[PDB]
Design a protein around this ligand. Structure first.
Ligand SMILES: *C(=O)C(C)(C)CSCCCCCCCCCCCC
Ligand SMILES: [Zn+2]
Lengths: 292, 7
């Protein structure tokens, strides 16, 4: 096996060896909760709870594309209610920027729409935003598709003006994937290429419950170590419906570090000798954001 | 391409 032991220390030694050149990160809502961003797919967040005044045919209609295009006001009213007070990426986000800086980041696949990967310094080429992003918005008319930045969209959301395209006056929609929209072609094209090349899968802040994102762990080569940094263990085969194997006598490459994602990434950076680099980057970028 | 669904 590539890991000398099934621990964070084993993963760090592997990352420092000549065998580990290309890292894929798979990240979800757990890497942004410490930035104040709620998990938008968690029932505990109550997205579908206080929608009475919108008179929706069904709760999920507020995130379905056909309903949105007919009645966009509920979605934008909710977007104003949930809009974050600040966009400050976490230690976890900046850990991935360090991976990029050190030439180790093959790709970050993210389920999040909060743009924090981009703010932290990952570029378009580095990212597969599996459910899109609020970072850009587009006119919904196929013949126009004018693109608008988040500052433009934010102003419309906060002034309670339904965003309309300045060229053709069609609705302008954030580039998140609504229910009933196609998933991004980039998700499938990158998956088909990246997983031929990966040396390590870093899975952070995702319960691996939403498809097709969760199936990415099964795309890794059989030898590729997979490290889960998450508050709870996840990704194992489901005894009912049925994967990660952390604990059996047959386990050989999967490792679980259970705790806050920031503390896990900090622990890994520390083992790698990157803790000062990570502290200096985070404190500098946070200072810069706080000073805007 | 496959469309986004609850699951
Ligand atoms: C699919 O599962 C989607 C992409 C719809 C999950 S997001 C569901 C909730 C979205 C609420 C609207 C966003 C609020 C403001 C967020 C701004 C982030 C930059
Ligand atoms: Zn337009």
């Amino acid at each position: 096996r590539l890991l000398d032991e099934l621990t964070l220390e084993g993963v760090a030694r592997y990352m420092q060896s000549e065998r580990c050149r290309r890292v894929i990160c798979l990240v979800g809502a757990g890497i942004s909760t410490s930035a104040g961003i709620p998990d938008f797919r968690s029932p505990s967040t109550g997205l579908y709870d206080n929608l009475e005044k919108y008179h929706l045919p069904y709760p999920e209609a507020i995130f379905e594309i056909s309903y949105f295009k007919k009645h966009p006001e509920p979605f934008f009213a909710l977007a104003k209610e949930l809009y974050p007070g600040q966009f400050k990426p976490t230690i976890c986000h900046y850990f991935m920027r360090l991976l990029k800086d050190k030439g180790l980041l093959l790709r970050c696949y993210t389920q999040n729409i909060d743009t924090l990967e981009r703010i932290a310094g990952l570029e378009q080429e580095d990212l597969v935003e599996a459910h899109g992003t609020f970072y850009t918005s587009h006119c919904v008319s196929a013949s126009c598709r004018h693109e608008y930045p988040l500052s433009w969209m934010k102003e419309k959301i906060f002034s309670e003006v339904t965003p309309k395209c300045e060229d053709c006056q069609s609705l302008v929609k954030p580039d998140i994937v609504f229910f009933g929209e196609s998933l991004p072609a980039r998700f499938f094209s990158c998956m088909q290429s990246d997983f031929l090349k990966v040396d390590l899968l870093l899975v952070m802040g995702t319960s691996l419950q939403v498809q097709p994102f969760a199936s990415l762990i099964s795309k890794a080569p059989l030898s590729t170590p997979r490290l889960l940094i998450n508050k709870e263990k996840a990704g194992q085969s489901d005894p009912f419906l049925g994967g990660m194997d952390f604990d059996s006598k047959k386990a050989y490459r999967d490792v679980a570090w259970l705790g806050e994602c920031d503390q896990g990434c900090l622990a890994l950076a520390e083992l790698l000798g990157w803790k000062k680099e990570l502290e200096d980057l985070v404190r500098r970028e946070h200072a810069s954001i706080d000073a805007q | 391409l496959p469309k986004k669904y609850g699951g």
